[PDB]
């Protein structure tokens, strides 16, 4: 995102009617933190939400 809002004004985007695939960025380990609380970082995507 070219611009990020402050924490008190966190920007929200709704995702619907699409296929969610993030394995491209998950395996790169390009993020300082990838904390998934009470959920597997990859198996959560194998379901319809």
């Amino acid at each position, epitope marked *: 995102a070219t611009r990020f809002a402050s924490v008190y004004a966190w920007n929200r985007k709704r995702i619907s009617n699409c296929v969610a695939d993030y394995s491209v960025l998950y395996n790169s380990a390009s993020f300082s933190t990838f904390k998934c609380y009470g959920v597997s970082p990859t*198996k*959560l995507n*194998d*379901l319809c939400f």
Partner: nanobody, 122 residues
Framework: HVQLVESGGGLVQPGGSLRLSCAAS????????MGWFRQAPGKEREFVAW?????????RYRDSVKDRFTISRDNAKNTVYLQMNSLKPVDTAVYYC??????????????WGQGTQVTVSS
């Protein structure tokens, strides 16, 4: 239509275990959360526990009952299970089975059953 039917009620000693199960019919509840609530007579119905029907099942419990009244569920049968363990007299109440959806990360009951009396007395 959707109906919830309870079963397994009765009275158990302090420290004696029990199990209450409520089956849900009519529709599917894989996007729902299977849960239980208890209402000690003369008081306001208090949460007990809820469980989601997901590959990464999320479980919540109620402070007074956390880690004691274990909760599980079934997706094929669409039923909620509540395994009560090592009870005390304070646990006497009418237990209701709740079927709801996860709204804003909070278990939001949508459909309710008729309940059942689970009593604990010395």
């Amino acid at each position: 239509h959707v109906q919830l039917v309870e079963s397994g009620g009765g009275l158990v000693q302090p420290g004696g275990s029990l199990r209450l199960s409520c089956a849900a019919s009519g529709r599917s509840f894989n996007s729902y959360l299977m849960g239980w609530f208890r209402q000690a007579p003369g008081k306001e119905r208090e949460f007990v526990a809820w469980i989601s029907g997901s590959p990464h099942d999320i479980i919540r419990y109620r402070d007074s009952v956390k880690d004691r009244f274990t909760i599980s569920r079934d997706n094929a049968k669409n039923t909620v299970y509540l395994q009560m363990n090592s009870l005390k007299p304070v646990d006497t109440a009418v237990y209701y089975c709740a079927v709801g959806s996860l709204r804003v990360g909070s278990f939001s009951p949508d459909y309710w059953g008729q309940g059942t009396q689970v009593t604990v007395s010395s």
